[PDB]
RNA sequence: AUGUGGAUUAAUUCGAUGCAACGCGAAGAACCUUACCUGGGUUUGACAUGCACAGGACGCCGGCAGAGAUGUCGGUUCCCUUGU
RNA sequence: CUCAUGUUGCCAGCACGUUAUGGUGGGGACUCGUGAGAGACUGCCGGGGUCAACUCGGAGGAAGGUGGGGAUGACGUCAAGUCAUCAUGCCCCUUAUGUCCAGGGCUUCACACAUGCUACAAUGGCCGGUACAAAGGGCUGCGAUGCCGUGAGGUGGAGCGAAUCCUUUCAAAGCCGGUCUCAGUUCGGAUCGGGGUCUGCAACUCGACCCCGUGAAGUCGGAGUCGCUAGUAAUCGCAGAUCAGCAACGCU
């Protein structure tokens, strides 16, 4: 992720449609999650790291 | 008649537990009826995720957004209880709405 | 893969979680928050070893709680560092906060310490057969722990080529979930690039 | 039956011998049904000419089908490829043009399936 | 079925006649899992049969299931380069259970533009002797008792 | 105050019983009208011929969960039981007929990289 | 209907290819995502840190010229204190 | 199964409802909701078993002998994949291989292979009537009743950060009646013409959806090849998610 795209998503658009999520932590065009904010594999590292208020292993 | 709604808001069952004993020693004490930690469905929220980068799709990890909720309706809102309520201090596991 | 994270499998039962707070709307922002301090307190604090981190929350305010081999240097006698990160914190806009640091009991079987010194080593001169053997005598010298083990996987000593390697001694019933397991891991340096090492740690068992 | 060129079906609905006719399909059907006042369930062995002279009125009255539909889309068709519009472009080439999978189907422009 | 045998489950008896062979019947005429439709399509057929033939249904069942049912079946067996055609007896539940399939998969078929009709004009078919399953019974016959011999291997 | 449920396969009904004629009240219409499939109504209808005691009592039913199958045999399921718990004395006939046994059989956990249940996509070597 | 080889185009970005790639990244391409092309510039910089040389401005709201990014002109102007 | 336990959720049993229904006063007698506990441990019997492990059969019980399904990948293999998540050693550009928009391309297209949907039709299509599920999302979002539109959709907008309010009282097959009598067909849906909406600064490449015209191919399939032993196979609907729309038949 260039840093130029990370900055040029973070600035405020000249108009609504160019707004996307871009993970936070690594900037990932795709494979990212609103509600948790942050990418894919990213989400799954924090999630063994562990601090996360609710996330755990789905079984039944 | 008034009845005040309190709304407890969060995920671990011990703690949930533990936030109903103290809510209704706090009752107890101070004198109002008070039905209990009444149950609540427990909404469960599941998240899919494969496990690797770069395709081997097959393979995922699942998870949970285990949320209690119980309710406490204590008729006779005495004003004392109010307060009581109001200065108790809880953990920040469980989230308290008072309605 | 081989093996899933032993902490998170045992987030459910055995261990506890890192930070404990359910808010909806604003979870993005929380989590955003956290990324960020989290982040920057790992790159500022190198010379003392931050083993654990919590944060507890309500409302406005935060609470953080970090678990450290020594806070000689994690907080000045004056509080030098002290208010050094209440500044980095204010300047992210953390709202009502403050510090609670707390010294390990064994660092000695703690997974990220053990981790954490072994490699600093290795990076300086040590080679992998006398770092590991001492962490491993130095962990297994406590008789709380019983089963412990460490990986090191990488161009071990510079080779144009990465070993698999590693020793064990003891029980790490990995696959029996009531075991007492802690995992830890850490990204080397070396010259040559970077070298990865793996831990487990076993504590005893938890009934009932 | 015979119906503007169209041979009406000996014995099937009205709905879909109306069908048959070139510029007509179910829904108009049902709708010409319900304002002429003819249910759809009949035969045609209970056809009567006054009937036909009805829908032939109100079919010339209020619809254009036919030989001047033929008409009408040739002249767009040709007035849009003399044009030089994207549209006219992919009618000369064969393809369709509302971009679909031209690569893998589109084998209905492209004519019966045809080997290299 | 590498352990011993597989429990086979007691299903439950058609109510109106008290034939479990019925209740096959329909198990076999399912597709896509329509039970009320596949009873409703066996009542049409069972009922256009009894009044075109003027007799018991059950009997006239019994007689199909009689007349159709087969007593021997072939098994292929490949030694020394080739395949060989062993047969070997069957019990009476494989005989039914292949008269019934029979019958249902060559009523499948015909094209007289109703299956409902169908089955009744084949089960009419298969008391009077002239029906498909008659036919596929007697080929199949053709080809094991065209081998008696190869029951030497006794497999 | 006799009381009996069913739970199978996500068929769940409530089912009160009372020593009266044999009416059906399914919601408040009569089987005959709810759900009229004679496997249906055989369904229902045979734990009572089992008993040997036909048109003895009445029947209040509330259903929630599943399909007519579904419903058709929780509700069987739910007399089947409520026989029993009205009167023990019938429970070795009951059982031989296996009535009481509920069938503990549902809805299988839809795995990942399965299109459904246990099949898998279409499988090609070359 | 979409993925994949392949050919054609100024671009047809790139990665992945049997079991274990192929409605796989791509869980949504009119501008972004966009890493590729013909097409106007631009440059210690769109984007931060620190050393020097001049600044109280930076920073905020509008009009004209343009196909837009381009630049010019109008409105307000630093918080500390004599070191910054 | 026992216990705790009645609101937004239920009704045994009392009253009002009087057409709109537990709708309303009332009540845990049950599910319902989620906490604690119990229960399958060959527990007991016979036969054999080396009197040992264990098998088969029988009573009990809900299940009998890992009751069912998931998570859980042993040492290692393939220098297997991923410097385009991230970070990382070396080299390479730096006045450029950096920077922004002077728009367009990422789908294009004579052809095959990979996995699905639509069907090829009567156990069905179409037309009218008619009952049943779970789970889940909702703030610069979900979106009531109402009106205008065939229908996308517009006006207006209650209730909801939420067992409540919107996702229709969440349905489809199911059941009743009418048409179709075996037709390239009332099956069948693409392709193509003309008229609109929505998201958005602007829909020509290069979106989605609606209406009208369009009527092609196509008859269970060649060797060989996939999967499937209990709610399994098959068939139907629904929702989470990336999103502003939308190629959403895809994954879950
Ligand atoms: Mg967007
Ligand atoms: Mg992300
Ligand atoms: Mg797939
Ligand atoms: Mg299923
Ligand atoms: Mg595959
Ligand atoms: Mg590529
Ligand atoms: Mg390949
Ligand atoms: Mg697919
Ligand atoms: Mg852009
Ligand atoms: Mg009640
Ligand atoms: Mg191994
Ligand atoms: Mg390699
Ligand atoms: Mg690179
Ligand atoms: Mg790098
Ligand atoms: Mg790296
Ligand atoms: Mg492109
Ligand atoms: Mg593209
Ligand atoms: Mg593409
Ligand atoms: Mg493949
Ligand atoms: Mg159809
Ligand atoms: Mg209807
Ligand atoms: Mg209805
Ligand atoms: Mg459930
Ligand atoms: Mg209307
Ligand atoms: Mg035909
Ligand atoms: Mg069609
Ligand atoms: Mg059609
Ligand atoms: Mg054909
Ligand atoms: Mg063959
Ligand atoms: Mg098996
Ligand atoms: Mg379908
Ligand atoms: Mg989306
Ligand atoms: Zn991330």
Redesign the interface.
Known sequence: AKKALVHKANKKPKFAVRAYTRC??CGRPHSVY?????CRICLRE?????????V??SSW | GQKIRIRL????HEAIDASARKIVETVTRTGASVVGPVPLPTEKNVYCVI??PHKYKD?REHFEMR?HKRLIDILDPTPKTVDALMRIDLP??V?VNIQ | ?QKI?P???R??IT?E????????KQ???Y??E??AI??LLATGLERAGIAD?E????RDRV?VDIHTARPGIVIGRRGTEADRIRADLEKLTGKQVQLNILEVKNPESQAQLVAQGVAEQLSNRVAFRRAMRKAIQSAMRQPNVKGIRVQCSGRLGGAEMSRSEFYREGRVPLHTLRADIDYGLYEAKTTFGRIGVKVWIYKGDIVG | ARLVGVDLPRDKRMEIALTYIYGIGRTRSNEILAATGIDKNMRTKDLTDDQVTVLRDYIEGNLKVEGDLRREVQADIRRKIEIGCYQGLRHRRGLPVRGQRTKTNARTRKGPKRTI | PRKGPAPKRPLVNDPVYGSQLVTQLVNKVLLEGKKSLAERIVYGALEQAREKTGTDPVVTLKRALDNVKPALEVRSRRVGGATYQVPVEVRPDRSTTLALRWLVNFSRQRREKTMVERLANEILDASNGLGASVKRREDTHKMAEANRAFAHYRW | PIQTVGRRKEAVVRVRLVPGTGQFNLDGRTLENYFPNKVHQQLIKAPLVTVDRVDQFDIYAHLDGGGPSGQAGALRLAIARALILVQPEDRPALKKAGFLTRDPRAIERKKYGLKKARKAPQYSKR
């Open positions: 936070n932590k609103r509600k948790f904010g942050l924090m999630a063994h790291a562990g601090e996360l208020p609710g755990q292993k | 808001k969060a995920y671990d496990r690797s393979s949320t920040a596991s989230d | 893969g994270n902490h998170g499998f987030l459910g261990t979680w890192k930070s404990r707070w359910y808010a909806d979870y993005k922002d989590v955003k956290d990324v989290r982040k981190v944060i507890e929350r309500t609470r």
